[PDB]
């Protein structure tokens with residue numbers, strides 16, 4: 111039928127019909143809900159490698175119909191010709207190439223349909239760099255450097271995606287092996303502990319195993335590990351003057367700066383797959399700007415990440431013998447004031463979780479008003495601190511899967527046969 | 530499939546859920562859309578004879594299985610005996626053992642409840658002989674006094690007669706057994722608890738003489754056998770209360786704040802074997818954030834962030850200062866400090882969530898699963914620094930269960 115979502119703080123009720131265009135399984139059934147599973151479904155739309163014609167063309171016709179609907183053509187001359195063009199193409203190459211207009215429409219709409227992203231109010235303001243002519247790891251490096259430089263924009267951050275050649279036969283994939291374009295190494299210490307970012311211990315070891323000489327610090331920017339057309343990946347060092355970094359200080363605790371903490375300014379997801387009309391872009395690094403809690407709650411305070419809660423609490427002179435003192439909670443707040451005060455002072459774009467979630471509510475309103483819906487994953491939209499004092503906490507959401515979309519994909523080292 | 534798997538992304542522990550195969554009723558999701566954040570996805574609708582027969586059977590089978598007597602002579606004769614009642618009376622009566630098992634497992638099956646590590650230690654008060662609202666008051670006073678235990682709180686449930694035709698329901702009209710009155714002022718302000726303004730109006734209309742203060746314990750509005758509800762004042766010496774002070778801020782006690790010790794849900798329906806127990810108030814003890822985050826700091830509730838932040842001398846001209854977050858923590862420190870100091874049972878969100886992970890893992894071990902509602906299990910503050918945040922969960926409905934039911938003033942036929 112049609113489904114209402116209610117906000118329990120304001121009583122606003124929105125009526126969703128967009129969900130009737132969803133195509134892929136969520137993982138839930140009438141009997142089981144998988145809303146907190148990280149990767150619930152394996153329901154693809156095309157399979158394994160090079161698809162047959164009855165597999166690829168129907169997904170292609172769907173996207174071409176959607177795009178031409180979007181611009182109030184549809185059935186027009188260009189639409190019908192574009193159909194016959196894609197059809198001849200799949201007959202002669204088993205794939206097809208998107209026009210520049212289609213590529214831009216698909217990237218933006220992948221962002222617009224990403225249920226887990228609180229930042230989608232900006233979706234239509236996305237700079238797309240077409241890198242489909244790229245042939246080598248060096249060329250991917252050059253494209254990524256220009257990406258990182260354009261996106262950073264001396265701190266006034268700008269949204270971008272750079273789109274390398276689509277998958278052909280599955281053995282010629284372009285990949286960025288780094289999960290984000292800029293991350294810190296994680297070093298396995300002999301005395302069992304971990305230096306740097308512990309999430310990157312494996313990837314940091316692949317880098318070392320590939321020739322990288324680690325400086326062995328707490329904030330070593332990792333090299334890029336770039337794979338072009340299925341070949342072995344290659345290491346490249348991002349010029350540090352393109353890597354904007356913010357030293358973390360606290361507006362009250364003068365001792366905070368003495369913690370020797372910094373973070374980088376540009377979040378840049380580079381291990382996801384962008385799916386458009388059955389085409390799969392296995393290398394599509396995209397970037398935007400941070401929500402402060404991403405750095406200061408998750409990066410800094412997860413137990414398997416930087417885990418700095420105890421040391422900050424120690425400096426704060428907090429009773430850390432029992433949880434009911436809420437010392438973790440108190441430090442957590444202060445760290446996130448620090449991150450926000452630092453980025454803002456160095457005029458690096460950042461948004462707090464209050465303003466960020468307020469904007470998403472406004473985006474939800476806009477999307478129901480003009481599109482009849484907005485897929486939204488509550489579990490990922492609600493921020494990891496102060497959930498209930500943000501408006502999304504009180505907002506019912508519907509989650510469904512629209513195409514074009516960003517998908518997860520296996521880490522290429524589980525997959526790649528070397529040579 | 531015969532097995533679904535859940536992973537903890539912080540610990541890498543992976544558990545295998547077989548128990549979801551035994552779930553029977555809807556979650557609200559479809560195969561193409563998830564409704565995991567929807568809060569709620571007829572009175573004459575009492576089960577028919579043929580409807581009730583498999584529900585009873587499934588429940589009795591489950592019960593004899595649990596006591597390792599499945600297929601036994603006593604099992605078969607119980608089944609036979611339940612069947613005869615449904616045939617003859619169009620309903621049946623639970624034995625005392627079954628009632629206790631049913632109510633414990635409704636708590637066990639409550640996917641939204643983080644405190645379920647305690648489910649088997651539940652004191653069950655059988656009140657199926659009650660016939661009038663005065664009798665209900667007597668039962669509920671005894672529940673309160675037993676559960677409160679001078680601050681050393683004990684979880685309990687009082688079960689009133691089950692539904693018959695939908696026209697003789699027993700109902701506690703209160704949502705909780707102890708709540709504070711809310712009063713809307715002519716100028717648009719609200720005195721007391723803004724969440725309780727509607728029910729406060731019902732009581733006053735029923736005759737309640739309101740003190741018009743900020744912490745007026747509301748009266749009980751008790752409905753027996755489908756008659757109009759009646760008012761009773763819980764004796765004030767049974768309502769344990771805690772003044773809220775701060776361990777560091779001298780001024781906090783000057784906010785005049787206090788809360789009650791006993792959380793006691795009274796508007797939910799307990800469903801066992803197809804039978805509906807429309808009045809079944811249960812109580813435990815608080816997790817700190819229920820008071821500290823939601824009761825005090827929701828904009829729709831007491832909304833004292835601004836007053837606390839002011840007395841904290843915080844910069845409130847821009848959100849990015851995180852003055853709200855900073856004030857919310859201290860309020861929650863105060864709530865925990867004050868209960869602990871007065872030796873009233875309370876649990877903080879870190880201990881509670883950690884215990885629930887242990888609980889979940891045990892339930893996977895001994896039961897084959899544990900349905901759980903991540904949207905609700907995760908505390909309303911500091912979510913990611915508590916271990917449940919990183920814990921994948923599967924949500925599904927098992928019976929016996931606790932269910933929502935429509936508010937009684939929306940359906941009652943006044944006499």
Ligand code: HEM
Pocket residue numbers: 221224226227228229230232236269270271382396397398399400401404461466490516
């Ligand atoms: C511009 C400001 C943006 C903000 C503040 C923002 C914020 C967020 C946050 C907080 C998450 C939660 C995931 C996590 O916490 O790890 C997320 C997820 C996501 N975002 Fe955005 N984002 C922004 C831009 C973008 C852009 C430009 C794209 C794509 C072009 C994008 C696509 C996604 C996707 C695909 C996910 C889900 C990724 C996953 O499942 O791991 N976002 N975003």
Ligand code: HEM
Pocket residue numbers: 636639641642643644645647651684685686811812813814815816819876881905931
């Ligand atoms: C023993 C201490 C207990 C603690 C600390 C506890 C904690 C909680 C919390 C925090 C919630 C979420 C409530 C909300 O945010 O509105 C909840 C929900 C719930 N609890 Fe427990 N609880 C306890 C005992 C019990 C008992 C004894 C029962 C019944 C016998 C019970 C049944 C439920 C149910 C049915 C829900 C879901 C409420 C709903 O769906 O609206 N709980 N619990």
Ligand SMILES: CN(C)CCc1cc(F)c(F)c(CCc2cc(C(F)F)cc(N)n2)c1
Pocket residue numbers: 229290292293309376377378379396397398399400401404
């Ligand atoms: C699996 N978990 C641990 C990942 C944690 C994580 C570590 C990182 F370094 C990192 F950059 C991210 C980006 C999320 C993100 C992406 C984007 C988009 F513009 F690209 C914008 C934004 N604001 N946030 C996430």
Ligand SMILES: CN(C)CCc1cc(F)c(F)c(CCc2cc(C(F)F)cc(N)n2)c1
Pocket residue numbers: 684705792793794811812813814815816819
């Ligand atoms: C449906 N929701 C939105 C209502 C909000 C709400 C407001 C309140 F005042 C209140 F007390 C509760 C108690 C839940 C609860 C129940 C129990 C159990 F032992 F009874 C223990 C516990 N710790 N908590 C919930």
Ligand SMILES: C[C@H](O)[C@H](O)[C@H]1CNc2nc(N)[nH]c(=O)c2N1
Pocket residue numbers: 118503504505506507565566567568904905906
């Ligand atoms: C919209 C959303 O489902 C709703 O606000 C939920 C979110 N999670 C919750 N979790 C708990 N414990 N209590 C609640 O009232 C809610 N409310």
Ligand SMILES: C[C@H](O)[C@H](O)[C@H]1CNc2nc(N)[nH]c(=O)c2N1
Pocket residue numbers: 146147148489490491538918919920921922
């Ligand atoms: C278990 C749960 O699915 C997992 O911890 C999720 C929960 N919500 C999240 N929300 C965001 N924004 N980011 C995350 O990584 C996660 N992780």
Ligand SMILES: [Zn+2]
Pocket residue numbers: 138139142143144145558562563564565
């Ligand atoms: Zn679901």
